[PDB]
Structure formats: structure tokens, C-alpha cells
From a paper:
CCs are quaternary structures comprising two or more α-helices supercoiled around each other with cyclic (Cn) or dihedral (Dn) symmetry. Here, we describe variants with all combinations of the aliphatic residues, Ile, Leu and Val, at a and d to give four classes of peptide: the ββ class, with a and d = Ile or Val; Lβ, a = Leu and d = Ile or Val; βL, a = Ile or Val and d = Leu; and LL, a = d = Leu. Peptides are named systematically appending the one-letter code for the amino acids at the a and d sites to “CC-[name]-“; e.g., CC-Hept becomes CC-[name]-LI. In summary, solution-phase data and X-ray crystal structures demonstrate conclusively that different classes of Type-2 coiled-coil (CC) peptides—i.e., based on abcdefg repeats with predominantly hydrophobic residues at a, d, e and g—adopt a range of distinct states.
Not all of the peptides with e = g = Ala were soluble, therefore, some were made with g = Ser or Glu, and suffixes “-Sg” or “-Eg” are added to the systematic names. By contrast, those of the βL class and peptide CC-[name]-LL showed weak or non-specific binding of DPH. In addition, we found hitherto unreported plasticity in the βL class of structures: compared with CC-[name]-IL-Eg, [name]—which differ at peripheral g and c sites—is a fully collapsed CC structure above tetramer. The latter makes an incomplete slipped barrel of five helices with a sixth helix packed against these to fill the void completely and consolidate a hydrophobic core; i.e., screw symmetry is broken in this structure. The two collapsed structures were more complicated. Nonetheless, both had extensive KIH interfaces linking all helices and, as such, are CC-based structures. [name] only had identity symmetry element (E) due to a Type-3 interfaced helix docking into a slipped barrel architecture, Fig. 4a. Sequences with β-branched (Ile or Val) residues at both a and d or with Leu at a plus Ile at d (ββ and LI classes, respectively) form cyclically symmetric, blunt-ended structures with central channels, i.e., they are α-helical barrels. βL class peptides adopt slipped barrel-like or collapsed structures depending on the amino acid at g.
Author numbering:
A (entry chain D), B (entry chain E), C (entry chain F), D (entry chain A), E (entry chain C), F (entry chain B): 1 to 30
Write the structure that this text describes.
């Protein structure tokens, strides 16, 4: 149901956060 | 129920954080 | 119940910290 | 149950991450 | 079922976020 | 069975997340 649906949305948001953190790590090196 | 609603709010707030981290990275780069 | 209320409060804090990070990124740019 | 308690623990860690990113941005702004 | 499947993807996304944060920490320390 | 193993993988990923955020704080402060 909607519990599982909401957890899939949360997982997708966490993947987007992990990508932004990789971008920040690269920008710190220049 | 309200648990599923709170998880969806958390997912939207994490997406907001990911976008702000992407902007921070570009500012350090430029 | 209690756990869903807590998750919603934490989501709001994360959202507000995201807004603050974006403001800092904006002034690092100039 | 345990599922909601784990989501709450995750949200606490994400909030702590956002505070660390803010302090990183502040140190770079100087 | 769907609930187990959604929690799998959630756990794997959190593992990827943890790895990205370690990469950030190492970039910051230099 | 499969849901039970979901939960346990989620719990381990959240401990790894917590450890990585401690590393991030130490690198910022150093």
C-alpha cells in the first residue's frame, strides 16, 4: 500500500542526496 | 495513515537539502 | 502517533537548514 | 514499531548532516 | 511483498549515502 | 522472512550512516 509507496519515494530522495554530496566533494577539490 | 504521510514529508525535505547542496557545490567551484 | 509527529518535526528542521545552506551558497557566489 | 523507529533515527542523522554542511559553508564564506 | 522490497531499496540507498559522506570527509581533510 | 531481513539490513545501513557523519564532523573541525 501507501506505506511501501512512501518508502520508495524516500529511497529515491536519498539517492539524489548522495549524488549532490559527491558533487560537493568534487567541488572542494576544485 | 499519518506514518506514511510523515515519510512523504521527509522525502520532500531531503530533496530540498539535495538541491541546496548542489548549489553550494557550484558556488565553491566558481 | 508519537513517532509520526517526530518524523514530521525533523523533516521541517531539515527543510529549514536547506534554506539556510542555499542562502550561504548565494553569498559565497556574489 | 521498529520500522518507524528506524525512520526516526535516519531523520535525526540527516538533520545532523545538514548542520555539518552549514558549518562547512560558513567556514568557506569566512 | 512490496513492503519488504521497498525497505531493501531504502537500505541500499542509505548505504550509498554513507559511502558518499565518507568521500566528502576525505576530500575535506585532504 | 524477507521482511524480517529487510529490517535488519535497514538497521545496519543506519549505523553505517551514523559512523560516516562522525567522520565528516571530525574532518571539518580538523
Amino acid at each position: 500500500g501507501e506505506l511501501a509507496q512512501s518508502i520508495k519515494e524516500l529511497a529515491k530522495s536519498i539517492k539524489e542526496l548522495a549524488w549532490s554530496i559527491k558533487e560537493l566533494a568534487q567541488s572542494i577539490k576544485g
